[PDB]
Amino acid sequence: IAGPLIFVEKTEPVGYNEIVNIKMGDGTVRRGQVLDSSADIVVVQVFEGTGGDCGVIFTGETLKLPASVDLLGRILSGSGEPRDGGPRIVPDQLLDINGAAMNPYARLPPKDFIQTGISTIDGTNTLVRGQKLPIFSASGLPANEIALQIARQASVPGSESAFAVVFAAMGITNEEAQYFMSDFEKTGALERAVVFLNLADDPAVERIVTPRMALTAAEYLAYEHGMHVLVILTDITNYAEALRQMGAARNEVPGRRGYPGYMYTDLATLYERAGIVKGAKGSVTQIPILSMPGDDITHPIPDLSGYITEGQIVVARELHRKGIYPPINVLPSLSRLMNSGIGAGKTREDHKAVSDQMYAGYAEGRDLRGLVAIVGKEALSERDTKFLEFADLFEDKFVRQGRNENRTIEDTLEIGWQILTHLPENQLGRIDNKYIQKYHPAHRK
Amino acid sequence: QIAGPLIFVEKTEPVGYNEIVNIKMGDGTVRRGQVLDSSADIVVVQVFEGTGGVIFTGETLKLPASVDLLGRILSGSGEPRDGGPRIVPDQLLDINGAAMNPYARLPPKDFIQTGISTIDGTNTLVRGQKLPIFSASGLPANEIALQIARQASVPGSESAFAVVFAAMGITNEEAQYFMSDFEKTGALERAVVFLNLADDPAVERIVTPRMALTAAEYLAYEHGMHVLVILTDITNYAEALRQMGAAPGRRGYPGYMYTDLATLYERAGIVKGAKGSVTQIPILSMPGDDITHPIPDLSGYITEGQIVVARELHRKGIYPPINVLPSLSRLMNSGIGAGKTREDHKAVSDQMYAGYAEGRDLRGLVAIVGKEALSERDTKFLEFADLFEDKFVRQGRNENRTIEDTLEIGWQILTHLPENQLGRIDNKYIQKYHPAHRKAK
Ligand SMILES: NCCc1ccc(S(=O)(=O)F)cc1
Ligand SMILES: [Cl-]
Ligand SMILES: [Cl-]
């Protein structure tokens, strides 16, 4: 009665709303209606149970991920076909992609540390295994540089489980695709990744399948192979631009009669797919890139805010215009699950205190940039001038890091302590005295 | 070619573009700067580095400050818009923020009841906080801002409460509607309302929030009030900065904008003496067409949380369409609990948020496996997300819910979940407040 969308291998032309029978990955059958198609893929909306044309009807099989540990090291299209000049994947298992396969997720909360090597993530809004932590951006800002840098650098310090990356790019140019391929190959980051690249001019249905192939590969490696898998998806806004024109959505208006029910829940079929996996040896973590579209009036898309429930990393033009990379502004950024990923045994015991203190000092110094403008630099107190200066040091030393610079959390906390020495010790009101004596550079060892 | 911070000066003598001038500061020192632009009555000066100081020496632009600002509707330059007399000042206060430092070195802290459950309940506004409403084109952020202006209060505070409502670049039809709403409801009697119209001079648009914040400072510090300042909309303020001294040069916003915004968002907090406070709720609207209105980086204003106005809920016909999941108030814990709201508040908030996030993920699961494949337990959480949106998020335009009202709606919809699944609620609160256990007193 208009349920789930599934994705089917196309073997003949089909018409809109054509009734079809589909053999699922688990061997059962479904009846449904065609919504749209590319050369090789059909999007079908399933009926529950029996019926919801009826004699001489198309029978098809679902589109599958060829799942194997040998996905690692390969660069594929959005449909899973090679782009790297290698042979097609030889599967251990053929899995449906819409999220129904495996039932992999545990009812356990996300928890341990993922070291991205980027101080403004690991330091102040830590990524934890099983989390969904979007990077929020806008045209012109280097969100894909950050995504690619995390793909090269990320690890799970101390874990007994192997680590893998799934990197899925949607709607990208040829030059972007060549650049991402080059990057993965030259750095050796490819050996632990599966890369799915969908181009702007590839079929829109292929773009819609892209994150499902990627999430299914991640779930397979996490659950069947006990891995912590980090899924980078770029750009969910480009996905949404294909979705709003696919199938039953075409020239229909959100909020109006004729807009199809599945458009309100499609994005949740992506964001639901993250978490610790059963057995607790592996996990699926997502870092989706959400770029602010500049065209809400002309191209209404489903609301992206459903993707934002466990925090956000905010890319700020102010910092970009100052010449700083990564231009992440930690103050509007948040990781709701950070405390589950930090402290003794995970990062270091002083982690929360240092993050809290850097955060508070930076927010105060940024407000003092306003006060300086209101009263003049020479009217600021000594103490306030220290905080004003601290916000510069924060931006120039802690936020700023090289594209190729992979900071351990120790590196990150040490830079944090060094800049914190600019503040008067009696002004560190978020840091327990135990930690000042043990870790502050004036008391250390 | 526009470098330093903007200071506003009373036009007392004719000035020229780029003229070098001194500005007299509230303590008798002077700063030096250069004329950037001017209207007939207000000069915009860019100040130089300098410090304390024959050429023009200008006076800062002043707010005519009196408790009799309350009940008045004024332009962005403070002139009457309500057919009343010009304000008779007890004090003339520099609007640039420099003659009086009312702020204490104290964190924001007690409760402001907006009467809107999706703020009070889950993302509480506290006194001294800056809590932006993040909106986008075609969403009802100004309805929400007006409803907060009508409803907000500080329950049990010994300090009286006031509102300052400042609207920038608005239409005549919007201005009439806001004036009508404040008049008819009586919300005007405790408010100072500053209305800048789209076609008023752009210089008055950038003075508008400075007039507003100076009025709030004056009431809060010199009259011991909690003042709530609602500023709508910082994107239109940014658009006016794209003007100052140009007829304009290229696409983006001026580089000094980020420091200029800080002169607005620094002006919030508890005031010295701790019997008053300035709280801000700025509306930050993303433009609907970035070709003609590029997207500004207003993230400098987002350091203590934000309230997210969401298209999904608006498309589903729910007012207020606030999505609690991406919303946050970083200072909420300072505003809630025994003696402020009610002891169970944090628990009920944590439980509703966890139950709604779970229910919303389960809408994704239904769209994968079909509704009939969901477990009976999962179905309760699915249904909970519907109850949360239809009973808790949804409320009338004029429905003013006490925090008690909000927490009781919360308990009623929480009864739909299995009691054993309430992992965020202390067994003591379940025994005392859960409708299945609570005793009639
Ligand atoms: N028209 C904007 C520039 C400008 C510059 C100077 C003045 S005046 O107040 O000195 F007559 C007025 C306007
Ligand atoms: Cl900007
Ligand atoms: Cl939507």
Domain annotation for chain A: domains and CATH numbers: 1-445 (3.40.50.12240)
- φ and ψ of B389, to 5 deg: -70, -45
Token reading at A377 = 């630099």
Distance between CA atoms of A314 and A121, rounded to whole angstroms?
10
Pairing between strand A228-234 and A275-276? unpaired
Is the distance from CB of B95 to CB of B76 less than 8 angstroms?
Answer: no
What sections of A324-381 are H helices per DSSP? 351-375
In chain A the first and final C-alpha atoms are separated, in Å, by 68
Listing from the earlier edge strand, what are the strands of the sheet with A19-23?
Answer: A5-9, A41-46, A29-37, A19-23, A58-61
B65 forms beta bridges with B91
One DSSP character per residue, A288-337 reads: EEEEEPS-TTTS----GGGG-SSEEEEB-HHHHHTT-SS-B-TTT-EETT
Give the separation between CA A367 and CA A369, rounded to whole angstroms.
5
Candidates B5, B51, B310; nearest CB to A305:
B310
Tokens found for residue A100? 């129904």
Determine which of B103, B123, B303 to mutate to test the interface with A (most A C-beta atoms within 10 Å).
Answer: B303
What residues contact residue B159 under an 8 Å CB cut-off, 6+ apart? B224, B225, B226, B275, B276
- A421-439 core/surface letters (b: 16 or more CB in 10 A; e: else): eebeeebbebbeeebbeeb
Give the separation between CA B302 and CA B420, rounded to whole angstroms. 37
For residue B15, report the distance from its CA to the centre of ligand 1, in Å. Answer: 6
For residue A218, the one-letter residue type is A
Q: How many CA atoms lie within 13 A of B248 on its CB side?
A: 12
**Declared resolution, Å:** 1.8
Q: CA-CA distances (angstroms) from residue A52 to A20, A98, A408, B382?
A: 12, 20, 55, 23
Ligand 1 atom index nearest CA of B15: 10
A292 contacts B264? CB cut-off 8 A: no
Rounded CA-CA distance A228/B64 in Å is 63
DSSP string, B291-341: TTS-----GGG-SSEEEEB-HHHHHTT-SS-B-TTT-EETTGGGG-STTTS
> HSE-up of B360 (CA within 13 Å, CB side)?
25
Name the helix (H) or strand (E) containing B164.
strand B161-170
Token digits of residue A106: 């545990």
The binding-site residues of ligand 1, defined as CB within 6 angstroms of any ligand atom, are: B 11, 14-15, 37-38, 40
CA B29-B33-B36 angle, 5° bins: 140
What are the φ/ψ torsions at residue B93 (nearest 5 degrees)?
-110, 130
Query: DSSP character for B219?
Result: I
Task: Show residues of chain B in contact with A294, CB under 8 Å.
Answer: 287, 289-291, 294-295
> Cβ separation of A294 and B306 shorter than 8 Å?
no
Of B8, B9, B10, B11, best ligand 1 pocket probe by most atoms within 8 Å of the beta carbon: B11
Neighbouring residues of the ion ligand 3, judged by CB less than 5 Å: A 302-303; B 312
Residues around the ion ligand 2 (C-beta < 5 A): A 317; B 253, 296-297
Q: Which residue is associated with the tokens 């060892």?
A: A445
Continuous segment of H or E residues that includes residue A416:
helix A409-420
Of chain B, the end-to-end C-alpha distance in Å amounts to 70
